[PDB]
């Protein structure tokens, strides 16, 4: 809101690639053309730019796996922040968008209240009580990036509860966010229904190697018909994984 919305998208010190740099110059020009077009157009352009970066990476695929994971973590954080900031200036009610690369985004801007809310799209759906998004009108968003292989390749899965693991993501990286920043101690549990999936099936998220898949308290209610229902007590970038030992 203070015309510093796009200043966070910078390449971390140490990295040196000619594709990430061009992507960040593109987002800088996007911020330049953000006070003129529309909040509903800058968001679509951000999604399309992320799709361009993910679909055709240059020397990003030649980066070290820790550096790629750090890039992915920063990218997901920045995407959540930008989506919150842009949705803060949208008309009240649902906002749905599907990129040509099938990157699905849904939002729900509405007043504060304690009304049960169901929202989502094909790749992810949510069943939350609105008393947890209020923490101005509240925001609840779902950003599902289908292809995230290059940045998330050679990642490690840590369960924190408890040798070898053969990770294979089965669903899109569904990033969930609300208005309040403290997104790890939600009062009422959230119900998720992710798709595209289908020796174990887990609901794990991307926890800041610079990043690793972590379970950390997300009960898998069950899987059926290529869709797993997870009950989670926090909000992060969730993705179903197969944990072939």
């Amino acid at each position, epitope marked *: 809101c203070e015309d510093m919305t796009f200043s966070t998208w910078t390449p971390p010190p140490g990295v040196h690639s000619q594709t990430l740099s061009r992507f960040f110059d593109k987002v800088q020009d996007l911020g330049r053309d953000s006070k003129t077009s529309s909040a509903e157009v800058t968001i679509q352009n951000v999604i399309k730019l992320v799709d361009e970066l993910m679909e055709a990476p240059g020397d990003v695929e030649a980066l070290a796996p820790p550096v790629r994971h750090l890039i992915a973590t920063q990218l997901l954080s920045n995407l959540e922040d930008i989506m919150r900031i842009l949705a803060k200036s949208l008309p009240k009610g*649902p906002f749905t968008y*599907i990129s040509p690369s099938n990157t699905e985004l849904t939002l729900m801007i*509405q007043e504060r209240g304690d009304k049960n*809310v169901t929202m*989502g799209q094909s790749s992810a759906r949510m069943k939350l009580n609105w008393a947890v998004a209020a923490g101005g009108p509240a925001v609840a968003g779902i950003l599902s990036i289908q292809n995230m292989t290059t940045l998330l390749a050679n990642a490690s899965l840590n369960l924190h509860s408890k040798r070898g693991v053969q990770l294979r993501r089965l669903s899109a990286v569904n990033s969930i966010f609300l208005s309040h920043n403290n997104t790890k101690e939600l009062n009422s549990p959230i119900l998720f229904a992710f798709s595209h999936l289908e020796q174990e099936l887990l609901c794990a998220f991307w926890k800041s190697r610079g990043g690793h898949w972590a379970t950390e308290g997300c009960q898998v209610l069950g899987s*059926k*018909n290529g869709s797993t*229902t997870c009950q989670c007590s926090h909000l992060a970038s969730f993705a179903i994984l197969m944990a072939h030992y």
Partner: antibody, heavy 130, light 107 residues
């Protein structure tokens, strides 16, 4: 494929009787409910009756419970609707749909009794002329 | 019975415009509200069931949500074959009730 073909509709005088038939092909009616939905000319959709042949579970509307009788014969795999004591308010286009209990899709996400009419018929026209 | 109230009952849009139809319901139907589309002279076709789930074959541009007793159907980008009449239905409590119907017309 799944097809529902209605029949039996036509002209009728008030106070008369008319029996509608809805033949179901491509599936067995013994696992879904066969709703009957009418639509008055130029008006919105309106429920009329429902049937669950494996349970019986006859259910009717308010302006309908007194006269219409809905039956389903598993031998012929068709559902009927024996409309009677017809009035001028019953002129409409009657569709037969197939109620689909989608609970078994995601039993951890849906409720037991949720249903939706996924395959509709084509609609037979009933005219009540005085 | 649950009276399904619908708005605006008549909508004039264009190609590419986002279209939202509201189906606020009396009492409280939790999430079982389905959306149908009826082109003139044709039988209705199921679009969305359980207020958020897309039926098989429906384009992905259709989306739904629930906000208590308020159910909305949104179309991400309108297309020339999307101009028809839309109804919302509940089956939780007998009798099942349909919406009054919202008609979408070209601009």
């Amino acid at each position: 494929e799944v097809q529902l073909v209605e029949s039996g509709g036509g002209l009728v005088q008030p106070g008369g009787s008319l029996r509608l038939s809805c033949a179901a092909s491509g599936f067995t009616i013994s696992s879904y409910s066969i709703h009957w939905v009418r639509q008055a000319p130029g008006k919105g959709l309106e429920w009329v009756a429902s049937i669950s042949p494996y349970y019986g579970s006859t259910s009717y509307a308010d302006s309908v419970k007194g006269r219409f009788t809905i039956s389903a014969d598993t031998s012929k795999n068709t559902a009927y609707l024996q409309m009677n004591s017809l009035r001028a308010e019953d002129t409409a286009v009657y569709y037969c749909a197939r109620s689909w209990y989608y609970y078994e899709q995601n039993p951890y996400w849906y409720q037991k009794e949720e249903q939706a009419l996924d395959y509709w018929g084509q609609g037979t026209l009933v005219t009540v002329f005085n | 019975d649950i009276q399904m109230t619908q708005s605006p009952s008549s909508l004039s849009a264009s190609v590419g415009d986002r279209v939202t139809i509201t189906c606020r319901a009396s009492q409280s139907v939790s999430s079982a509200v389905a959306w149908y589309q009826q082109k003139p002279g044709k039988a209705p076709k199921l679009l969305i069931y359980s207020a958020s789930s897309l039926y098989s074959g429906v384009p992905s541009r259709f989306s739904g949500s629930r906000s208590g007793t308020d159910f909305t159907l949104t179309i991400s980008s309108l297309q020339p074959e999307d101009f028809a009449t839309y109804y919302c239905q509940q089956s939780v409590y007998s009798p099942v009730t349909f919406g009054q119907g919202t008609k979408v017309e070209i601009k």
